[PDB]
Amino acid sequence: SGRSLLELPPELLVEIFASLPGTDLPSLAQVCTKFRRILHTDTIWRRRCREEYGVCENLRKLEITGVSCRDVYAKLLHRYRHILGLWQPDIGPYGGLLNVVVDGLFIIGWMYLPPHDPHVDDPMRFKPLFRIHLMERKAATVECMYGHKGPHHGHIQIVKKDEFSTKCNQTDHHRMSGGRQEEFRTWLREEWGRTLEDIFHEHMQELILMKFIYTSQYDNCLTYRRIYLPPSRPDDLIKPGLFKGTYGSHGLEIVMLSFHGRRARGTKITGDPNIPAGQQTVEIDLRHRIQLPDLENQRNFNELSRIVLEVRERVRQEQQEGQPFVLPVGVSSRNEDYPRTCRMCFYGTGLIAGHGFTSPERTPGVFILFDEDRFGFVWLELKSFSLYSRVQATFRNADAPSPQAFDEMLKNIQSLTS
Amino acid sequence: ASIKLQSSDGEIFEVDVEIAKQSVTIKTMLEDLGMDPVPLPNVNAAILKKVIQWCTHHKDDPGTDDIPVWDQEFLKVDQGTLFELILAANYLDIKGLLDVTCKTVANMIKGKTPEEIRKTFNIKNDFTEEEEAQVRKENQWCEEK
Numbered sequence: 042s043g044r045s046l047l048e049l050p051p052e053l054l055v056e057i058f059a060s061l062p063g064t065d066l067p068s069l070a071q072v073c074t075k076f077r078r079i080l081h082t083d084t085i086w087r088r089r090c091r092e093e094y095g096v097c098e099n100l101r102k103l104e105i106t107g108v109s110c111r112d113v114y115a116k117l118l119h120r121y122r123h124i125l126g127l128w129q130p131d132i133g134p135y136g137g138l139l140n141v142v143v144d145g146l147f148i149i150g151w152m153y154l155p156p157h158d159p160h161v162d163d164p165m166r167f168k169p170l171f172r173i174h175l176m177e178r179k180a181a182t183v184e185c186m187y188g189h190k191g192p193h194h195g196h197i198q199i200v201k202k203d204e205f206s207t208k209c210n211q212t213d214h215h216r217m218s219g220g221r222q223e224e225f226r227t228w229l230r231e232e233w234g235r236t237l238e239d240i241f242h243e244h245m246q247e248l249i250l251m252k253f254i255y256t257s258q259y260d261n262c263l264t265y266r267r268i269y270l271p272p273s274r275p276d277d278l279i280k281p282g283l284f285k286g287t288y289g290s291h292g293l294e295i296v297m298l299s300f301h302g303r304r305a306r307g308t309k310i311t312g313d314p315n316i317p318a319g320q321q322t323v324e325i326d327l328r329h330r331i332q333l334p335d336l337e338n339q340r341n342f343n344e345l346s347r348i349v350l351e352v353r354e355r356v357r358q359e360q361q362e363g364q365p366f367v368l369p370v371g372v373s374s375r376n377e378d379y380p381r382t383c384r385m386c387f388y389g390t391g392l393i394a395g396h397g398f399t400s401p402e403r404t405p406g407v408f409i410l411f412d413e414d415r416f417g418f419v420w421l422e423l424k425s426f427s428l429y430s431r432v433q434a435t436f437r438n439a440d441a442p443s444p445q446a447f448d449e450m451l452k453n454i455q456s457l458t459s
Numbered sequence: 460a461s462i463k464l465q466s467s468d469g470e471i472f473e474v475d476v477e478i479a480k481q482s483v484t485i486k487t488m489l490e491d492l493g494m495d496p497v498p499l500p501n502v503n504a505a506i507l508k509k510v511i512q513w514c515t516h517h518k519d520d521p522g523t524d525d526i527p528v529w530d531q532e533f534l535k536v537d538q539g540t541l542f543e544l545i546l547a548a549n550y551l552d553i554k555g556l557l558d559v560t561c562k563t564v565a566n567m568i569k570g571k572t573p574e575e576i577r578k579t580f581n582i583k584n585d586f587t588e589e590e591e592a593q594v595r596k597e598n599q600w601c602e603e604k
């Protein structure tokens with residue numbers, strides 16, 4: 042006989058409603074009196090926050106603050122769903138990394154900076170740039186967390202799909218009582234931990250200064266473009282993600298390793314004015330393994346060059362139709378604490394350019410795999426070594442939706458810096 | 460190997476013990492209360508039948524979240540029967556059947572507007588003019604983008 046939905050006990054109905062997407066709850070709520078009333082049951086929304094946005098709200102916190110999960114879903118989670126993820130700020134050539142994330146009754150824009158040069162194995166430093174706070178009865182507030190004088194008014198604008206912007210409404214807080222000299226030393230201390238001096242090298246001294254001045258011009262009014270972590274694959278792979286790498290005088294840069302057939306790509310997440318954020322910095326030819334000779338041939342620079350240009354050669358013909366390691370004499374390395382065993386070597390090419398990314402080109406070199414989360418690149422024509430090491434942090438909402446989508450994201454961030 | 464089940468309206472069913480005990484309710488009535496036959500005053504005979512088919516299909520069971528075909532087919536019935544199954548499955552405590560009958564209702568709601576939901580399930584709009592204005596407002600946030 043002819044039962045309807047409307048005759049089911051409330052408890053069954055809650056089961057069923059608690060199982061649906063949160064975005065279907067608001068239609069159900071407008072169907073009738075009984076559904077509106079039932080949909081005031083927080084358990085339903087507490088499940089919707091957990092399963093869809095990863096957040097398990099505290100009940101005690103909910104009681105103190107007077108906020109409910111219906112509120113959280115509606116006014117925080119869904120309202121702001123599009124800025125969640127992993128981002129790269131648009132800051133001329135320098136990039137950056139923001140992971141925008143849900144904690145409790147907050148959404149937090151976390152900036153991840155590299156460790157001090159040259160300590161590529163030290164962990165990423167991290168600080169909030171902005172937060173979004175839900176309180177009882179109110180719309181969620183937007184606040185900027187830069188830089189030293191506490192949280193203060195901000196704005197957010199979701200431009201599209203894959204871009205958003207922050208404004209700060211009260212920059213009086215970024216300032217410091219000593220002035221801009223002091224802003225500069227604290228900044229120097231956190232990014233370098235070196236003395237306003239120590240290095241002497243006017244060149245790094247100059248690069249550091251200019252970067253300070255260029256980025257600090259974005260007070261902190263920035264636009265962010267979406268980026269993704271690279272797809273895991275079992276065979277055609279030995280372990281992607283983000284690494285921290287030595288880039289000489291520019292200091293440490295963040296580089297995303299990803300796999301693309303029998304070829305790996307090194308993509309800049311942060312960069313410098315020679316080769317900017319968003320560009321291919323490295324490419325590893327994964328079918329042109331190079332054999333590691335004994336250790337006194339390893340020491341021989343020219344042996345190494347002959348061998349590497351001979352592979353360059355054979356590569357150019359086609360596109361027509363652990364164990365002891367040491368750098369060669371003449372090859373510099375900012376680190377010196379690069380491992381003395383390695384598994385494999387492979388031919389690869391780096392991207393080089395003059396200042397302003399002028400007249401870029403691929404120079405030969407050789408990629409060196411040390412550990413699961415440690416590798417290097419010998420820059421032949423610069424007689425120079427780069428040591429990369431895995432960024433150990435973990436990132437929320439950062440996965441490409443699909444593989445072709447990741448290869449699209451690479452294409453967009455490369456083009457904005459073309 | 461066999462016990463007797465009694466429908467709300469008198470019909471008796473000889474069912475295998477281990478099939479019957481997928482219903483935790485029955486298993487309690489048989490073991491703890493010693494009933495044989497087990498009167499099910501809330502489940503009519505046509506419904507009991509289907510519930511015995513289901514449990515029997517599912518007798519061996521080591522699930523996922525996506526409705527197996529065999530069960531989709533079992534559920535190609537009319538609404539009223541689908542809700543009688545939900546209620547029967549709630550009364551008898553058969554988790555698998557409850558789950559699968561409820562997911563099924565839920566897929567019938569997935570993405571519908573309030574209008575389409577009322578027509579699907581014949582629910583009368585019982586809001587007053589004010590209340591309805593009020594629900595609309597309370598739920599604007601969903602058309603945010």
Ligand SMILES: [Zn+2]
Binds near residue numbers: 187210212
């Ligand atoms: Zn600010």
